[PDB]
Amino acid sequence: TNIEPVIIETRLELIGRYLDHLKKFENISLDDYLSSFEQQLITERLLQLITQAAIDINDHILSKLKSGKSYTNFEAFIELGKYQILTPELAKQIAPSSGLANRLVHEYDDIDPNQVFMAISFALQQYPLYVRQINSYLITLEEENDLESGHH
Amino acid sequence: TNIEPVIIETRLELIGRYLDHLKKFENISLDDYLSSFEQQLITERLLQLITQAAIDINDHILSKLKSGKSYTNFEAFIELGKYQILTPELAKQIAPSSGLANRLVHEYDDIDPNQVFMAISFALQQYPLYVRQINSYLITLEEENDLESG
């Protein structure tokens, strides 16, 4: 209806490409990761852009569904889970990771690579589910719109 | 004055680490760069962190030297040059790179690697001078602090 699918689809595509490259680190050992600033830089940027892309999708959706309402990045995930856009279970699991987009940008003097190593596996598990659920939401909206007004 | 040297020293140390790694990309060819997403990710984050660290230093300095006044990231560089904390020549050269910290974070769907490639060379030429000039400024603060005490 009011949401613009191209803004969302573009970001879902980028998240897919970011995840494809992040998956190359799925089996890296702790020792190898902690020894390589270069691999930390790659994964930190990928995690930052995945989470920021998801934040931008969420803000756009809520700007059309809950116009004039303000949400923190954490609250935005939970609200999508309340309205069946994400499952409440995924929303609650993935909402903490929303702080990564901020800490990797502004708390660069305080990045513990042991913690980022864990965030890699959490993102590879959670954000493919996020992409599929947002994508399913788009399909449902389009179907409901087609049913309401005939084929588009 | 009310400046906390630890804030500036920690960011200068981080900029030094980032520049040492960015230096590994000083002589790469553009065609290879365009073909490597991993090279683009590494250099993008290094440029983002260098510029954000400098912005943070500049914001701290000006929050004490010009409290109450607000500056954009571009204007913060120029103001430091105006007060000879940086040279006006370096401040003018380096101020446009200050937008990198925002574009690499929020305009991730609109990054031209050809422009980032150019930004590598600019940052390798300009931010070593920035680090030296800020370090000279810290020394003047320590000298002043030595006078006020002993």
Swiss-Prot record, chain B:
Name this protein carries in UniProt: tRNA nuclease HepT
Motif position, RX(4)HXY motif: 101-108
Subunit: Homodimer. The fully di-AMPylated homodimer is not found in a complex with MntA.
Keywords annotated in UniProt: Endonuclease, Hydrolase, Nuclease, Nucleotide-binding, Phosphoprotein, Toxin-antitoxin system
Family in the record: Belongs to the HepT RNase toxin family.
InterPro entries in the record: HepT-like, HepT-like_sf, Type_VII_TA_RNase
Superkingdom of the organism of origin: Bacteria
Post-translational modification: Di-AMPylated by cognate antitoxin MntA on Tyr-108 when both are expressed in E.coli; GMPylation occurs much less often. Leads to an increase of mass of 659 Da. Di-AMPylation moves the catalytic His-106 away from the catalytic center, leading to loss of nuclease activity and thus toxicity. Probably one subunit of the dimer is di-AMPylated, the complex dissociates and then reassociates to di-AMPylate the other HepT subunit.
Pfam families tied to this protein: HepT-like
Protein role: Toxic component of a type VII toxin-antitoxin (TA) system. Upon cloning in E.coli inhibits cell growth for several hours; eventually cells recover and start growing. Cleaves the last 4 nucleotides from the tRNA acceptor stem (shown in vitro with E.coli tRNA-Glu(UUC)); only cleaves intact tRNA. Has no activity on mRNA. Neutralized by coexpression with cognate antitoxin MntA, which is due to di-AMPylation of the RNase.
A GO CC annotation given for this chain: toxin-antitoxin complex
EC number: 3.1.27.-
Tagged with keyword Disulfide bond: no
